[PDB]
Each structure stands twice: as structure tokens, then as C-alpha cells.
Amino acid sequence: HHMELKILVTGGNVFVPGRLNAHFSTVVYLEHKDRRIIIDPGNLSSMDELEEKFSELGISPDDITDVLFTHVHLDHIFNSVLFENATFYVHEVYKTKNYLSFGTIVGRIYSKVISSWKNVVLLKGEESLFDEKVKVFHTPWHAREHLSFLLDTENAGRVLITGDITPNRLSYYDIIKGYGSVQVKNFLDRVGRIDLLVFPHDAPLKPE
Amino acid sequence: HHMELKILVTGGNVFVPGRLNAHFSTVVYLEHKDRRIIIDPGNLSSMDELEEKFSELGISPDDITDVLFTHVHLDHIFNSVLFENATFYVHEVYKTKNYLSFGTIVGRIYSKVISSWKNVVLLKGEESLFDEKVKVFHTPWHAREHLSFLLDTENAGRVLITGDITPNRLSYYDIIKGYGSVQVKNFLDRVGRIDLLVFPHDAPLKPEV
Amino acid sequence: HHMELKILVTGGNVFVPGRLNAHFSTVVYLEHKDRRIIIDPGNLSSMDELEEKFSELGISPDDITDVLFTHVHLDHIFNSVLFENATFYVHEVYKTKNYLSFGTIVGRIYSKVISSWKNVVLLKGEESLFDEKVKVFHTPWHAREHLSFLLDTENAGRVLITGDITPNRLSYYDIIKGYGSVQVKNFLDRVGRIDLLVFPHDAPLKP
Amino acid sequence: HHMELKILVTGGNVFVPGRLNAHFSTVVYLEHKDRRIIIDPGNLSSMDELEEKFSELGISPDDITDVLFTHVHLDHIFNSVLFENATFYVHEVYKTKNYLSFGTIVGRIYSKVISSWKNVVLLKGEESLFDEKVKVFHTPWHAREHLSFLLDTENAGRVLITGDITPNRLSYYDIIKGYGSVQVKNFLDRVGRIDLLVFPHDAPLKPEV
Ligand code: NI
Numbered sequence: 001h002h003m004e005l006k007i008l009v010t011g012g013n014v015f016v017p018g019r020l021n022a023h024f025s026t027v028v029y030l031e032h033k034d035r036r037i038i039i040d041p042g043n044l045s046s047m048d049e050l051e052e053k054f055s056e057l058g059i060s061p062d063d064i065t066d067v068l069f070t071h072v073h074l075d076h077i078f079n080s081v082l083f084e085n086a087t088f089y090v091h092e093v094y095k096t097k098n099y100l101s102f103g104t105i106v107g108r109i110y111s112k113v114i115s116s117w118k119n120v121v122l123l124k125g126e127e128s129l130f131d132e133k134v135k136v137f138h139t140p141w142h143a144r145e146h147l148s149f150l151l152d153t154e155n156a157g158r159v160l161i162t163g164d165i166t167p168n169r170l171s172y173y174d175i176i177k178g179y180g181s182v183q184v185k186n187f188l189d190r191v192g193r194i195d196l197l198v199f200p201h202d203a204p205l206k207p208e
Numbered sequence: 209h210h211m212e213l214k215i216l217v218t219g220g221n222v223f224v225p226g227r228l229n230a231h232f233s234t235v236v237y238l239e240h241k242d243r244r245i246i247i248d249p250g251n252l253s254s255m256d257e258l259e260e261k262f263s264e265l266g267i268s269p270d271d272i273t274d275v276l277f278t279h280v281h282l283d284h285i286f287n288s289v290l291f292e293n294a295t296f297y298v299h300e301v302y303k304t305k306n307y308l309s310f311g312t313i314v315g316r317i318y319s320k321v322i323s324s325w326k327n328v329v330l331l332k333g334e335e336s337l338f339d340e341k342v343k344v345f346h347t348p349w350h351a352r353e354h355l356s357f358l359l360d361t362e363n364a365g366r367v368l369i370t371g372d373i374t375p376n377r378l379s380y381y382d383i384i385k386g387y388g389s390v391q392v393k394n395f396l397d398r399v400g401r402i403d404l405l406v407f408p409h410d411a412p413l414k415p416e417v
Numbered sequence: 418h419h420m421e422l423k424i425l426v427t428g429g430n431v432f433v434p435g436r437l438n439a440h441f442s443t444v445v446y447l448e449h450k451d452r453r454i455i456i457d458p459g460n461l462s463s464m465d466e467l468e469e470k471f472s473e474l475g476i477s478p479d480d481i482t483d484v485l486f487t488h489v490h491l492d493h494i495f496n497s498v499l500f501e502n503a504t505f506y507v508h509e510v511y512k513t514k515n516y517l518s519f520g521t522i523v524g525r526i527y528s529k530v531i532s533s534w535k536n537v538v539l540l541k542g543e544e545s546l547f548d549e550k551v552k553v554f555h556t557p558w559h560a561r562e563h564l565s566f567l568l569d570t571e572n573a574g575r576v577l578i579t580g581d582i583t584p585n586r587l588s589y590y591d592i593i594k595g596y597g598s599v600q601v602k603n604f605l606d607r608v609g610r611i612d613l614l615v616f617p618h619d620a621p622l623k624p
Numbered sequence: 625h626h627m628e629l630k631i632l633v634t635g636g637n638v639f640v641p642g643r644l645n646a647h648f649s650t651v652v653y654l655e656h657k658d659r660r661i662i663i664d665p666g667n668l669s670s671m672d673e674l675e676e677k678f679s680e681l682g683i684s685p686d687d688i689t690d691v692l693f694t695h696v697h698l699d700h701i702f703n704s705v706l707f708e709n710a711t712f713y714v715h716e717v718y719k720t721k722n723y724l725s726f727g728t729i730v731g732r733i734y735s736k737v738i739s740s741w742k743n744v745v746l747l748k749g750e751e752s753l754f755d756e757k758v759k760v761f762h763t764p765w766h767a768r769e770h771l772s773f774l775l776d777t778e779n780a781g782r783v784l785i786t787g788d789i790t791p792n793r794l795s796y797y798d799i800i801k802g803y804g805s806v807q808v809k810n811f812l813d814r815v816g817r818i819d820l821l822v823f824p825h826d827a828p829l830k831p832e833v
Pocket residue numbers: 071073142164
């Protein structure tokens with residue numbers, strides 16, 4: 001039973017201080033057996049791209065069975081409100097944050113999104129999920145609850161969903177050049193040879 | 209009892225076909241007597257600006273008493289989900305649209321936003337609200353439920369919230385130059401002399417003499 | 418001799434009053450005989466998409482022979498600076514505008530772009546260009562120099578490059594619904610049956 | 625003779641892979657004696673904001689005497705084409721990069737911008753400029769030519785223009801939390817107590833005690 005990967009959205013940034021916040025994460029779709037899995041469902045601003053991709057795939061949001069989060073930042077999780085039948089997976093320490101302290105307005109939005117998750121599995125890191133096709137790593141070098149996911153796929157080989165420990169190619173290159181996070185560098189060394197790096201705010205890359 | 213206007217957000221556009229939709233409306237705040245009124249609460253992408261402005265004003269979303277919509281487009285209405293204590297005002301023909309036919313995904317979002325409105329006043333056009341400080345016009349030259357609002361303010365004089373019949377200054381200039389919508393031009397002629405045009409996707413403008 | 422169309426970039430809008438102006442036009446590429454033609458070269462913010470498309474096509478900006486402008490707005494014309502070997506086509510009345518009056522900063526950028534056009538063909542409207550494959554219409558319902566182009570293509574049929582008289586699909590729908598520009602509506606009636614509408618700030622549409 | 629700081633633009637990001645690149649840096653303006661100084665003139669997309677700030681200041685691009693670059697990335701340097709009378713300052717090792725190899729189109733744009741700089745001062749790091757009001761640091765943890773600038777200002781105290789070694793507040797917080805660049809962290813330790821951090825793609829921040 002093979003796991004197939006599709007990148008529904010490659011993420012990016014839209015940010016003007018005090019005026020515009022439309023960051024949007026990469027959205028990863030996986031099919032394995034009877035599971036239809038999303039990692040980082042993304043932000044509202046990706047709605048038209050997702051509409052198009054769901055239509056190509058012949059599926060509805062109602063068919064998504066499992067949704068995993070690298071972390072609890074709105075630009076990665078907002079679209080979670082679409083998936084009423086999914087089980088949601090997230091690192092347990094997210095429960096130690098007071099999201100209502102994020103600002104009157106912003107906190108209310110986090111709270112409404114988070115409250116919509118009716119079935120939640122809390123992770124610790126090191127789990128291997130979906131018949132060992134998905135390995136979970138606790139990678140708290142961005143947010144305390146941050147996770148990265150290593151995927152054993154048929155069509156794309158061994159794929160690392162980095163999350164925001166490496167938001168884009170430049171951040172990855174900074175690690176290679178030796179002046180980035182020592183923790184992230186050590187983590188990448190631990191993971192070892194992979195076929196594809198899937199960043200949250202850039203197009204993916206085959207490591208050199 | 210004077211009505212005071214503050215423009216919390218001047219709107220704009222962020223659109224890349226097939227990739228990015230982050231249009232965001234102008235957000236207008238009005239204080240009159242014990243009412244705290246918003247016209248077009250805007251889009252999620254304005255959340256940091258709104259945070260700042262609410263903080264300057266010393267208010268919370270819970271203090272908003274009334275929210276009016278030019279029309280039912282997400283970039284104007286999304287933030288309506290923040291105002292749990294407000295009465296919502298919208299043109300009655302919005303009920304004749306099937307929002308779930310807007311796309312599986314996009315329809316679901318519209319439906320969830322619209323369902324959050326627990327107290328709704330249905331407008332027809334021509335209403336004079338808030339002790340005659342707000343005049344409602346049915347201006348369906350964009351969407352069937354579209355409304356424009358004329359405000360009698362103390363601090364900004366006579367202010368027309370156009371909505372999307374004139375999204376920005378260039379669209380207004382096209383009317384003035386004679387090659388824009390005949391219906392919108394007629395409407396502006398009807399309204400007559402005003403002090404300020406507040407567009408949904410641009411900075412406001414003092415009109416030509 | 419057939420004319421082939423490729424849409425290199427579908428345009429859009431990025432605009433925050435007082436803070437951000439990154440509007441970018443649709444960029445149309447046409448090959449006909451030995452001509453490599455661009456209509457509305459676009460804005461700086463399309464640079465990565467253009468790099469990718471030029472690389473797919475196996476061409477350089479040096480190989481572009483002809484560049485036509487719907488009108489002289491920066492989000493349509495900026496990338497003209499890349500095409501040093503091209504002949505530029507533009508409506509003659511652009512010369513009657515004082516671009517340095519656009520603002521000290523913005524005027525300077527217009528002036529620098531416009532000064533880079535070394536070979537210019539001035540159009541009036543109604544011209545048929547490239548062995549009658551491109552018909553030029555003067556459509557001054559946005560800017561006095563504004564042009565629209567009707568293209569007789571092999572791969573996409575009859576294609577109207579609207580320019581900013583209809584920036585996107587919504588503006589076209591407003592005309593269909595009867596409350597948009599009467600002049601644009603009459604223009605579209607005059608053009609008649611076409612296979613594709615190519616807007617400057619949206620994906621194209623089969624009418 | 626005091627040096628006055630004005631932040632003309634706070635920078636940001638606009639990036640959609642394969643479709644849109646409109647990153648734009650913070651733009652810093654300094655007045656000292658007869659000098660009108662820009663650090664990182666920014667990107668084309670800031671043109672309306674710059675227009676408005678230049679108008680407020682009562683100056684033209686022709687009045688800018690000095691322009692310094694944190695580094696040679698288009699979103700920081702593009703607007704350099706506006707300043708015909710300026711001396712440009714940049715780390716010498718930029719000359720070792722082949723900008724034509726950045727891609728046919730992108731390389732062309734870099735080359736045209738860089739060619740417009742008629743008077744250039746090549747920096748090495750550790751220079752003290754403008755009567756010692758500006759200290760230059762070689763901070764190559766982003767690009768080989770990358771510089772940061774420490775400013776002694778009258779109106780904002782001691783200000784660090786970080787450049788892209790810390791693009792925004794989150795990158796700075798990562799350093800404070802202990803999992804960011806060791807080199808950047810050691811650099812901030814070396815700089816010591818300052819009043820303001822000016823990031824290239826975010827609003828500035830008063831540092832942590
Ligand atoms: Ni994050």
C-alpha cells in the first residue's frame with residue numbers, strides 16, 4: 001500500500017507591517033489506503049487554488065480524514081475549519097499557550113479555529129503514523145509545539161515537510177553555508193538523505 | 209448628538225489568479241450616542257491593523273453594537289465573525305443567493321460567516337438609520353444586494369461609503385470622464401454635494417467641485 | 418504562416434494604499450514568421466515567472482523584435498527596459514502627456530522607462546499589423562492612448578487583448594449585466610465573436 | 625552637529641513562488657550637516673510611500689548625497705536608480721559576484737541597477753563614517769557583501785540597521801530564544817546596548833533589556 005503525495009499549494013508571504021498579513025503555507029495532500037491526509041491546510045488566501053486542486057482530485061473537504069499541523073500559526077491552520085470529518089494532529093504543548101493573549105482580535109480568531117477541531121490527537125514527537133509512512137519529529141526551533149514530518153512516498157521518495165524551522169530555500173541555504181541554526185542543522189543531519197525538502201513558504205527543493 | 213467617523217483600514221487588493229486572494233475592504237467605524245458601528249468589517253488580512261486601531265480606541269470587538277454591509281463578499285464581511293454582540297444590517301435580497309454554489313470550499317466559508325450573524329436587520333434601500341445620520345441606498349451595480357451609505361458626520365462632513373460600485377479612485381475618475389457606469393454616475397448626481405468619497409479598495413477622496 | 422500565442426503571465430493586483438504598489442499586467446507572447454512579439458511586457462514583480470517562461474521557450478529578451486503597449490502605465494510597460502532590440506508600438510497621443518508631472522519619484526521612473534524606447538512606431542488605431550494578424554483598436558476608456566488588440570491565432574483562435582478597459586472578469590461581467598461602460602459594451606459588440614478574452618489583471622475567459 | 629533619523633518605509637514581503645516577487649526593504653533616511661543619506665533605498669513597489677515622504681520632507685531625489693547598501697539584493701537597491709547625485713557605499717566583495725549568472729532576466733536587471741552607480745565607495749567593514757556617527761560592520765551571514773550599520777542619532781538614540789541577517793522580529797526572537805545563528809547572536813552581543821533595532825522587512829523594535 002503506497003502513499004502518494006501532491007503539493008496542492010506552494011506557500012509564500014504577503015506582509016506589510018501594520019496593514020496586511022496574508023502569509024500562506026504550503027499545503028500537502030497524501031493518499032494512503034482509505035486515508036486522505038492534509039499537512040498544513042493553509043490560509044484563507046489560498047481558497048481559489050484549493051478549490052481548483054480539490055476539483056482536479058474529485059474530492060470535497062468532507063472526504064479529508066486526517067489533518068496534521070507543523071504548528072499552530074494561522075497561516076498554516078486556518079483552513080482546518082473546512083474539514084469537519086477529520087482527525088487533527090498537533091503537538092501536545094500547544095495546549096500550554098494562551099491564544100487569547102495573542103491580541104483581542106487575533107486571539108479570537110485562533111480561538112475560533114482551534115475550537116472547531118472536534119477530534120484531536122496530541123503528539124509528543126517520534127511517533128511513526130499511517131503504517132510507518134509518516135515519521136513525526138519534534139522540532140521546537142520556531143514555536144514550542146513545532147513538528148516536522150518525514151514521509152515515505154511512492155511518487156516523490158523520501159520527503160521532509162520542514163515547517164517553519166526553514167521557511168524557504170534561503171533559510172536552508174544559510175544552514176548549508178554554516179551560519180544558520182545549529183539545532184536545525186543537526187536535525188537535518190539526523191534525518192539524512194532525502195529526495196525532497198518541502199518548505200512552508202517556498203517551492204520545494206531536491207537537496208544537493 | 210454628533211456622529212464621529214474613523215477610517216480604521218483603507219482597503220486594497222491582493223490578487224494573483226489561481227494562487228492568492230487577499231482582497232481587503234476599507235473598514236469604517238462610527239460612534240453615535242451609545243452605538244459603536246462598523247461598516248464593512250473587512251478581511252482577515254487586516255487583523256494587525258484592526259488590532260492597533262481597536263487598541264487606540266480603547267474598545268474590544270464585544271463593544272461593537274451594529275455592523276452594516278455594502279454587500280456579501282468575503283473581503284468585506286469576513287471579520288463579522290468577531291462581533292458577537294452586534295446587530296447586522298444587509299439588503300434582503302442576499303437571502304436569494306445560494307452561497308454554497310460559490311464552490312465547495314469558498315461556499316463553505318461564506319456559509320460559516322453568514323451563519324454567525326444571530327441578529328439581522330434586512331434592508332430594502334432608502335432607510336434612514338441612527339437618528340437620520342445614515343442614509344441607505346440600494347445600488348445593485350456590482351451585486352444584487354449591494355448598498356451604499358451616506359453619513360452625516362461631525363468631523364468629516366457628508367461622507368459617501370460607495371462600496372464596490374466604485375472600488376477605487378480610478379473607477380470614480382472613469383465616471384467623471386464620461387465612460388463609466390451610467391447608473392453609478394446617475395447615483396452620484398442624485399447624492400449631490402458631499403465632502404468625502406470612501407472607496408472600499410483605495411484611500412478616500414474629496415470630490416471635484 | 419501561422420501566429421502562435423502563449424500567455425507568459427496572467428496579471429493581477431497588489432495594492433495597499435500608501436504602502437505597496439505591485440500591480441502587474443498579463444504578458445502575451447506571439448510568434449509569427451521571424452517575429453517574436455510581446456504585448457504588455459509587464460512589471461518588475463513578474464521577473465521570476467518571465468525568467469521561467471523565457472527559459473522554457475529557449476529565448477532571450479534580446480530575441481524580442483516587437484513590443485506593443487495597450488497603454489503607458491508602469492505595471493504594463495516597466496519590463497520594456499529588457500528588450501533593447503525591439504521596435505515599440507504605442508498610440509501617438511502618449512506624447513501629449515507630461516509623465517514628469519506624475520510625481521517627482523514616479524514621474525522619474527516613467528521617464529526613464531519611456532526614454533529607453535529607441536525605435537518607436539506611433540499608432541492611431543485601426544491599423545492591421547503583422548500580415549493582418551493583429552488588428553489595433555483605439556479604446557480610450559481608461560487612458561487617452563489606450564489600445565486593444567485583436568489577434569488571429571492558430572492555437573487559440575480569435576483573441577482579444579482588452580487592456581484596462583476591462584481589467585478582470587468581474588468588469589466584463591458588469592458589462593454583460595448591463596451596468597458597465599456603454600462605450601466598452603459597444604466596442605465588444607463591434608468586435609463580435611471571439612474565442613478568448615485576455616484581461617490584463619485576471620486569467621482569460623472564453624466569452 | 626546632530627544626526628536625525630527618519631524611517632521612510634518599514635519593509636515587508638510579497639512573494640508567491642513562480643508568480644510574484646515584490647519584496648521591499650525598509651528605507652532609512654538620515655540628515656547630518658549638509659548630507660542627506662539613504663540606507664537601503666528599497667524597491668519599486670514602495671514608490672507611492674517614498675513619493676509621500678519626500679514630499680513631506682520637502683526634498684527631491686536630486687538632493688540625496690549618499691546611499692549605503694546593507695547588501696546587493698534587488699529589494700534593497702532598486703530605487704538607487706533615482707539618486708543621480710549620490711555617492712554609493714557597498715562592501716568591496718560585491719565585485720566578486722557574477723550578477724549575470726542570476727538568470728537572463730534577473731541578471732539583466734541587477735546589471736542595469738549596478739551600472740547606474742557612477743560614484744562608489746568600497747567598504748571593508750569597521751569604517752566609521754559621517755564624523756563617526758555611522759559605524760560599519762561586515763556581517764556576512766546572508767550574503768558575502770552584507771553590512772550592518774550602527775547609528776548614533778539625536779532623535780532615536782543608538783540604532784542598529786541589521787539588514788537581512790535578521791529580516792524581521794521573529795528572526796530576532798529566534799536568536800534571543802537560543803536557536804538562531806550563533807554568528808548573529810555574537811554580533812548583537814558585540815554591539816551591546818542599543819535603543820532600536822531596524823529590520824529590513826518588519827517594523828523596528830526596542831530590544832529586550
Ligand atoms: Ni510559523
